[PDB]
């Protein structure tokens, strides 16, 4: 009984794994590419003096 | 005394062999709800399991 159903946790925290996996994944993509836009655009003498 | 010896020996017997033979199948009456209480847990959670 324990077995079946914890080796069901087993496949069914793989997939909250994988869930949380491309959701932080792409989150991430999100805001570094975010950013990544944000001070190439800016330039680096630009930011440099900004900051 | 030999004649209320026997006596004792069996007045104490009795109240023993008593919970003996009860404890004898009342353990192989767990013994069976073992095995059976078993297959209750070991399948609910085969298909709570799914």
Excluded at chain 1, 6 to 19: C, F, G, N, S, T
Excluded at chain 2, 13 to 35: D, W, Y
């Amino acid at each position: 009984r324990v077995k079946k159903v914890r080796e069901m946790e087993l496949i069914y925290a793989r997939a909250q794994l994988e869930l949380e996996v491309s959701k932080a994944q792409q989150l991430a993509n999100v805001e570094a590419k975010k950013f990544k836009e944000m001070t190439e655009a800016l330039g680096p003498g630009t930011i440099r003096d900004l900051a | 005394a030999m004649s209320m010896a026997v006596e004792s020996t069996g007045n104490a017997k009795a109240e023993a062999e008593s919970r003996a033979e009860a404890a004898r199948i009342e353990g192989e009456g767990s013994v069976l709800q073992a095995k059976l209480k078993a297959q209750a847990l070991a399948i609910e959670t085969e298909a709570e399991l799914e």
